[PDB]
């Protein structure tokens, strides 16, 4: 294992953080859910631009005090539910957050999850991507259920990270 990348998952309760982690790292999903108590840990190694990295993923909670695990995180997946507008609405407060408890030079990806719920969409992809480039965040929509873009999401952020090559 060449490198070690620590990444955190944050977001409102219900958006799919815990299932994102289980899909991407153990390829498992569940409709029935247990609220994450504090923190959960899972790991998976990938290669980007020819280089072997290892990601340590932390599934936090929506138990307000999970803050400490933030420290020494190169990347954070901030997730909202496309089908629940309020979860997207609090993304502004979630970016004010990262600008209080986390590295000011951290890689962030905005994630619209549950893209499979086509008919229930409450947040338009354009509106999201607009806010995305209005800010300094990378953007994508995933479905943990059908596994659309789940691999893509991780591989994107990890590649973005590696672009921090020091000379």
């Amino acid at each position: 294992y060449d490198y070690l990348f620590k990444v955190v998952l944050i977001g409102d309760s219900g958006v799919g953080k815990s299932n994102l982690l289980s899909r991407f790292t153990r390829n498992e999903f569940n409709l029935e859910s247990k609220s994450t108590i504090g923190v959960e840990f899972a790991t998976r190694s990938i290669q980007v631009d020819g280089k072997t990295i290892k990601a340590q993923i932390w599934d936090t909670a929506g138990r307000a005090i999970t803050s400490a695990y933030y420290r020494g995180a190169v990347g954070a997946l901030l997730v909202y539910d496309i089908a629940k507008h309020l979860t997207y609405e609090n993304v502004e407060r979630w970016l004010k957050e990262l600008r209080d408890h986390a590295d000011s030079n951290i890689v962030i990806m905005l994630v619209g999850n549950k893209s499979d719920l086509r008919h229930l969409r409450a947040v338009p992809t354009d509106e999201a991507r607009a806010f995305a480039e209005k800010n300094g965040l990378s953007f994508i929509e995933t479905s943990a259920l059908d596994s659309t873009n789940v691999e893509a999401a991780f591989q994107t952020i990890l590649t973005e990270i590696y672009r921090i090559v020091s000379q």
Partner: protein, 465 residues
């Protein structure tokens, strides 16, 4: 009908059944449940066999009479079951006697098989050194082999089988004590059902070292007459001829429930219950964990610190093998910490903690628990990457999670202990408030913020030494 409504609902399981059976003073309910035992899966009820049999002995006749019919039924369809009953019946009474004799009234081959094993162990008492003992054992195990493959089995085995051969050269004695326990390997031919199957035919016969389990199977197999058969498997048991295993069985049950609880919830704690067999109040057998050795001796053969050994045996901090092992360490630590706390396990030292090849720890000597009267050394904290470490924080996170889980199923646990306390002379029940103190230790009244602090306090306590 409101009661009967519940009993006929999906909510009704063997757990609930025993609780009402144990508590209800209504003879109509007791009798009703006695009958309902038959509908449940054999496997589910088996787990509670020590409780049922204890109740039979120590409770009102009404309660007993409701249980007996089901027991006899099982006894009639399985001699294994018969065996385990008779042994338990005897051990837990020193009401019982009437039924034990009826069950024993067939099993002679097995009882002599078991008798001899016990007899062997008692003789080694005259040999004052460990290795002196080992040589008498190896010799004497060879005498067992002279008895053909017999109409006997290891109740500690997951399955039905016949014992064919004992690889005596591989057996070893575990300490130098007066009534020292000893480990043996046993060869068996698997069955589909023991009760209907011919004893296998003899196959004529014609070095022991520290090695992984699969390497030991190869070596024993290759040398064995029966080894060519696909039917052939290798088992292992520890034989304790003069040590009580009734507390050991109780702890086992508690560990198994907690294991299920943490499995049911989604808390990735890790623990390892090892099977127990009560033979008398005097004597028992244990199914040992393979690919594991005590921390203390791990430090005596390696001459290393715990962290260093991990690094040697698995790899550098950049390796998969290490991080996997570290994770398994942390998860097994949180599990057993919680178990030690809940059961108030004492006498905790590196002689009583095993390390497996994947990095889990395993506690083993469950004397001194509950009313009868765990350490987080820096050596352990080092393996976790240190106090500021994420993996250490995670250790604390797991403990809380596992504590929150336990509370949600507290009653399943207390039940197991509370019944066993019945008419009991076990040292762990010496107090007036054994079960009552146990319940307090779940802190059911506490809020989670309160529990975080208690978890913090727990960890702080574990460090003082």
């Amino acid at each position: 009908s409101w009661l009967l409504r519940l009993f006929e609902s999906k909510l009704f399981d063997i757990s609930m059944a025993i609780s009402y059976l144990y508590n209800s003073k209504e003879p109509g309910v007791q009798a009703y449940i006695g009958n309902r035992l038959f509908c449940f899966r054999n496997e589910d009820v088996d787990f509670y066999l020590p409780q049922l049999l204890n109740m039979y002995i120590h409770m009102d006749e009404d309660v007993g009479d409701a249980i007996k019919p089901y027991i006899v039924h099982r006894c009639r369809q399985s001699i294994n079951f018969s065996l385990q009953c008779a042994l338990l019946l005897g051990a837990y009474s020193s009401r019982g006697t009437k039924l034990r004799k009826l069950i024993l009234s067939r099993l002679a081959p097995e009882r002599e098989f078991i008798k001899s094993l016990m007899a062997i162990g008692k003789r080694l008492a005259t040999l004052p050194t460990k290795e002196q003992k080992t040589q008498r054992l190896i010799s004497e195990l060879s005498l067992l082999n002279h008895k053909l493959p017999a109409r006997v089995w290891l109740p500690t085995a997951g399955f039905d089988h016949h014992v064919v051969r004992v690889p005596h050269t591989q057996a070893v004695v575990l300490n130098s004590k007066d009534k020292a326990p000893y480990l043996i390997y046993v060869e068996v031919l698997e069955c589909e059902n023991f009760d209907t199957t011919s004893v296998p035919a003899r196959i004529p016969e014609n070095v022991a070292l520290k090695e992984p389990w699969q390497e030991k199977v190869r070596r024993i197999r290759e040398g064995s007459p029966y080894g060519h058969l696909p039917n052939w498997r290798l088992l292992s048991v520890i034989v304790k001829c003069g040590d009580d295993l009734r507390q050991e069985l109780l702890a086992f049950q508690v560990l198994k429930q907690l294991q299920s609880i943490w499995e049911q919830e989604r808390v990735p704690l890790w623990i390892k219950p090892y099977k127990i067999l009560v033979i008398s109040a005097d004597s028992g057998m244990i199914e040992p964990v393979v690919n594991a050795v005590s921390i203390h001796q791990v430090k005596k053969q390696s001459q290393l610190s715990l962290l260093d050994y991990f690094l040697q045996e698995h790899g550098s901090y950049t390796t998969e093998a290490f991080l996997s092992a570290q994770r398994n360490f942390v998860q097994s630590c949180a599990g057993y910490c919680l178990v030690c706390y809940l059961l108030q396990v004492k006498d905790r030292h590196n002689g009583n903690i095993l390390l497996d090849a994947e990095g889990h720890i395993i506690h083993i000597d469950f004397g001194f628990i509950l009313s009868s009267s765990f350490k987080l050394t820096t050596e352990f904290v080092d393996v976790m990457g240190g106090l500021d470490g994420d993996m250490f924080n995670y250790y604390k996170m797991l403990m809380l999670q596992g504590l929150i889980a336990a509370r949600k199923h507290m009653d399943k646990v207390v039940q197991i202990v509370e019944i066993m306390q019945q008419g009991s002379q076990l040292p762990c029940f010496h107090g007036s408030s054994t079960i009552r103190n146990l319940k307090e230790r779940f802190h059911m009244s506490m809020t989670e913020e309160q529990l975080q602090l208690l978890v913090e306090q727990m960890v702080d306590g574990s460090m003082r030494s």
